[PDB]
Amino acid sequence: TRDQNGTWEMESNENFEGYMKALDIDFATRKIAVRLTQTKVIDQDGDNFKTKTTSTFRNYDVDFTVGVEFDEYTKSLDNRHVKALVTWEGDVLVCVQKGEKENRGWKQWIEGDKLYLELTCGDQVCRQVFKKK
Known part of the structure; x- marks a missing residue:
């Protein structure tokens, strides 16, 4: 649904390096970050996340x-x-981050115990998948 509540544990992370590089994050930080798995905790009540x-x-x-x-x-x-704005487009939570970078934002949507997250900046997209603890 449009209920993303949960603790979600990362299964895969594709092109996080590309996304970070588009954001100008430094090499040393990118080298650490690309080796680290993630957890995402979402608390949602109505429209409030x-x-x-x-x-x-x-x-x-x-x-x-x-x-x-x-x-x-x-x-x-x-x-x-x-300037960030998060909206629903169907069951996809869409954020546009207006500012210096083009094409900056993310999209996040779930099926059952899977959460898909795409992070975008410029010509880079990072694709992540998490599974609900």
């Missing part, structure tokens, strides 16, 4: 309400401000 993406190196938390624009400062990722 609290997300936590965790690893042994660094975590990234973002909270939002569907349909409500927000300034997203990508602290400790690439350290840029983007």
Whole structure:
């Protein structure tokens, strides 16, 4: 459904290097990050989301309400401000991150105990799959 609640454990991560490179994340950080699996914890109530993406190196938390624009400062990722907006298109949660980079955002959708996440920046797409603990 449009209920993404859960703890989701990463199964696969394709082209995270390309996506990070498009964001100008440095080589040393990319080399660490490409070796680390992830967990994503999603707490959703109605339109309100609290997300936590965790690893042994660094975590990234973002909270939002569907349909409500927000300034997203990508602290400790690439350290840029983007105007983010998350909407539903069917059962796909779609975020556009407007700012310096083109084609920046993500899409996230589930089937059963699988969560698909695509991260985009410029001409790069990172494809991730997670499975619900």
